[PDB]
């Protein structure tokens, strides 16, 4: 058998030719999903071979996950009450209908990262951020109870 793995693979860097991280893709709900504007390749042997469907109106592109990758994907939840959430760089506020973070928590290369509740479900995917000074308001994709995509930008 090949070395035993002990962690689930579900967030993947997207890199240009130089190896610069341009953003992220996630495995979630049977798909690999990434922002369309995030340009480059996923350094994963199975994902890099997939043919992606573009949905430019949500700044999204996606493909069906390889079967062996399905069990390890994020779950999504439509429930996002006002409060605080989590991402790689710390707390993400949800208030007044917007996700915000402290300015400079992000970087240019963090597009495509998920925002998660405390149970570890994804509530949104980050597209970008508008710098408003102390706070940065995030542009995100969410999906409703019918599974319909929603892009919200500030």
Q: Which of 1, 9, 18, 37 is catalytic?
A: 37
Sheet of strand 60-64, all strands in order from the earlier edge strand to the far edge: 41-42, 11-15, 21-28, 31-35, 60-64, 53-55
Distance CA 41, CA 32 (A): 13
Q: Which domains does the chain carry?
A: 10-74 (2.40.10.10), 75-154 (2.40.10.10)
Contacts of 76 (CB under 8 A, 6+ apart): 28, 29, 121, 122, 123, 143
Asked whether 87 and 93 are in contact (CB, 8 A), the reply is no
Has 117 been annotated as catalytic? no
CA 139 to chain centre: 11
Beta strand 98-102 with 122-131 is: unpaired
Structural determination approach: X-ray
56 is catalytic: no
Give the active site residue among 56, 59, 72, 110.
Answer: 59
What gap in Å lies between CA 96 and CA 100, rounded to an integer? 10
Q: Is 111 a catalytic residue?
A: yes
Catalytically annotated residue among 71, 72, 111, 119: 111
């Amino acid at each position: 058998h090949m070395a035993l793995k002990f962690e689930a693979d579900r967030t993947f860097a997207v890199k240009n030719e130089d190896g610069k991280i341009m953003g992220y893709a996630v495995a979630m709900e049977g798909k690999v999903i990434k922002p369309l504007h995030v340009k480059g390749t996923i350094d994963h042997p199975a994902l890099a071979k997939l043919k992606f469907t573009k949905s430019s109106s949500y700044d999204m592109e996606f493909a069906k996950l390889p079967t062996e990758m399905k069990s390890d994907a994020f779950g999504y939840t439509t429930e996002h009450p006002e409060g605080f959430y989590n991402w790689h760089h710390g707390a993400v506020q949800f208030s007044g209908g917007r996700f915000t973070i402290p300015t400079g928590a992000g970087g240019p290369g963090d597009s495509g990262r998920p925002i998660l509740d405390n149970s570890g479900k994804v509530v949104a995917i980050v597209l970008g951020g508008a710098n408003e000074g102390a706070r940065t308001a995030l542009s995100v994709v969410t999906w409703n109870k019918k599974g319909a995509a929603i892009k919200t930008t500030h």
